[PDB]
């Protein structure tokens, strides 16, 4: 229990690293799409672990149920050529890959800090050695969950954003028809 169940988040992180590497290294691009589906299941696992199971279900519904399905549909209908990962083609990238890995990872951990000193900026990243104290109160009498609150703000406080999104979806219809259909 405890040992496994304490490091569930860390396991999801390790699996995510492995899944990304497998996406990039796959011989068949269909296999790459399947590893992308695996990565999305791992992301849903992480979101459940941090308390957002509704986003787990939404991600499964939309990114696997719709986007990955479209991916597979397209690779099935279309003639794709792909080359395999090899030293002759890809060892030339290793120096730049290593420098970029270190620089981008460190900077992506440092952008979150507010300390003036750069080394302290990086050090704060690994600085959660403490547990959060979860406490109760009794001020919420309604049964309001994340989905309900999202509906509440999206339809009232930010209604304009919803209507603009309607225009964006209109684009997602009109555009594909404009460039995939030949009129007359």
């Amino acid at each position: 229990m405890m040992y496994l169940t304490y490091y569930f988040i860390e396991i999801t992180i390790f699996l995510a690293i492995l899944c990304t590497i497998f996406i990039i290294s796959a011989k068949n691009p269909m296999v790459s799409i399947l590893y992308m589906i695996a990565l999305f299941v791992i992301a849903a696992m992480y979101l459940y672990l941090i308390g957002l199971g509704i986003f787990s279900l939404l991600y499964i519904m939309i990114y696997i149920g719709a986007i990955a399905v479209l991916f597979l549909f397209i690779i099935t209908l279309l003639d794709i050529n792909s080359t395999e990962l090899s030293v002759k083609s890809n060892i030339r990238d290793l120096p730049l890959v290593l420098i970029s890995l270190i620089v981008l990872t460190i900077s992506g951990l440092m952008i979150y800090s507010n300390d003036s000193i750069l080394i302290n900026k990086l050090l704060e990243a690994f600085g959660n050695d403490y547990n959060t104290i979860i406490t109760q109160d009794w001020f919420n009498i309604e049964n309001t969950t994340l989905l309900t609150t999202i509906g509440n703000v999206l339809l009232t406080n930010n209604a304009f954003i919803l209507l603009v999104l309607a225009i964006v979806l209109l684009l997602g219809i009109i555009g594909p028809i404009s460039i995939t259909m030949k009129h007359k």
């Binding site: 149920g65 719709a66 549909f73 099935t76 309604e142």
Partner: protein, 340 residues
Amino acid sequence: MIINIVEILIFLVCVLFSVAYLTVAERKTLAYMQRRLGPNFVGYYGLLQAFADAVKLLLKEIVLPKESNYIILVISPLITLITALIGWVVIPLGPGITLGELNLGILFSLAIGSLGVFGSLLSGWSSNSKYSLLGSIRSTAQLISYELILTSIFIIIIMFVSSLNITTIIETQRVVWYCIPLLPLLLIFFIASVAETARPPFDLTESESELVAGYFTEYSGSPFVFFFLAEYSNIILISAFNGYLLLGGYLSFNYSYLFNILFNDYSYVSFLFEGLINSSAYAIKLVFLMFSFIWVRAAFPRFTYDNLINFCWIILLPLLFGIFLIIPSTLYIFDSFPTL
């Protein structure tokens, strides 16, 4: 732990055997509609027929064709069956009487359902045949097309309830089943469920295609068992969706008066009797819907691909958008927005 294990074993056995006997029921019911008998010989009254088919298939050699991704062809039917069975974890046979009592149960149903197209999609890729790829493409297009219809009806129902908990949705129908105010939606949901399971008359892929028998043409042995089991399991599960969304789930009639006559206090006897009544109501609704699947198979010829795509996108979907407009309008007119 022990109680959990016992409950899961009971539920799983009931579901798997119900699926096994649905195939026998289809054969018998089609037979009597066609003035014949159907299986009456393997077991008494032909009651062991499904188990004979299962054992035969479990002893049949698996063939992996030469141009085939053998792993993908052996795992695709496995995942379709796994998602098909996972769908059962949220179905309640009484108030809170379920394996998974999820406040997001409706969302779970939709998400696991949307994982149902990957079998058709991956089966064609399993080989290296262009016949297979075209057939899988069509079947996938039909599946997602009618997924839209089913999701729309789900949302229309939730407009009346404002809850994603399946027990709560059933509980609100003690006043009226939702098939009564929304009878056209009962018709549309049944039509779309038949299409979503790729059942006749929506069986393009298997019965008018380049390959002789759909994208399962190349499957023998246990993979074939997986596809067959997943199909019938999805028939019953989509009928259970129909039952709890529109048919009042485990509700039959108010038995408060009868129970007050029979019993004078709470006991395991009264609890067992109430559980039996609830489960029997849901079961009889499932039986009628399964019978309807078979009856529709008996009565009609097949659509073509073009016909069914037109039916979904030009006839059904515009009606469902009009209903999207008219239901909240009626709730607004009469000041009947449901609370949480």
